């Protein structure tokens, strides 16, 4: 097709949003974490990061096939060009959506809100996150709705470092008396050249190398190596 690139990019963004929403209302029950889309000549590959790769793959390799068909009617993409790859996540306890859905299913599986929040707090610190908050709001008791917070570790709330040092997941949880809201915010730790943290430190953090402990010479000498 011939197309102005501005419209191309906004339509591509709408395409990504459509994928994300369809799979969030679709693939959530399978430990959904996220989706990465690769563009290759005349085809688009859809790698799925999800903690439950066996659930999404399913028996007989059924469901992971069917999805490729179900999008094909809506997007109108060429046949054969669309394919998806279901992978297990590389960010288990540091992808906010993963433990947000986890908490969703704890609350759905007859587990207390405070106990579930404490458990995910424990798990998140076991992963090694510098801090976590779980803002759960709703009618936790009676009919007077209220909020409820579980903050531990530390957490930055302002500035650019929030975008990449904080993973934020806002989800709606089913309840008998209404709809609860869950906000799971994880402050990602820092590791360099690693796979669990951003490659740059907090800009307000200054780290100093300890200087060498060389003994000061007291008489000039000629060293032959």
């Amino acid at each position: 097709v011939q197309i102005s690139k501005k419209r191309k990019f906004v339509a591509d963004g709408i395409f990504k949003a459509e994928l994300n929403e369809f799979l969030t209302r679709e693939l959530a029950e399978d430990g959904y974490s996220g989706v990465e889309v690769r563009v290759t000549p005349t085809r688009t590959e859809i790698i799925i990061l999800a903690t439950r790769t066996q659930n999404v793959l399913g028996e007989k390799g059924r469901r992971i096939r069917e999805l490729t068909a179900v999008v094909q009617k809506r997007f109108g993409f060429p046949e054969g060009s669309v394919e998806l790859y279901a992978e297990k996540v590389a960010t288990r306890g540091l992808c906010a959506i993963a433990q947000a859905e986890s908490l969703r299913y704890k609350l759905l599986g007859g587990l207390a809100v405070r106990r579930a929040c404490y458990g995910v707090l424990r798990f998140i610190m076991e992963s090694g996150a510098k801090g976590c908050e779980v803002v759960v709001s709703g009618k936790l008791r009676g009919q007077r709705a209220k909020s409820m917070k579980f903050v531990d570790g530390l957490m930055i709330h302002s500035g650019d470092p929030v975008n990449y040092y904080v993973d934020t997941a806002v989800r709606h949880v089913l309840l008998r008396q209404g709809v609860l809201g869950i906000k799971v915010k994880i402050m990602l730790p820092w590791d360099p050249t690693g796979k669990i943290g951003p490659k740059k430190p907090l800009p307000d953090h200054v780290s100093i190398v300890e200087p060498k402990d060389e003994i000061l010479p007291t008489t000039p000498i000629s060293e032959q190596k």
């Binding site: 207390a112 405070r114 106990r115 404490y118 936790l140 008791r141």
Partner: peptide
């Protein structure tokens, strides 16, 4: 640790069940 009783206590320190939870935690 009975985190159930403690968490129910922190839900309502002065609740209708507060005395029962406080008594449960004692011991």
């Amino acid at each position: 640790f009975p985190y159930e009783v403690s968490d129910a206590l922190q839900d309502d320190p002065k609740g209708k069940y507060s005395k029962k939870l406080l008594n449960k935690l004692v011991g």
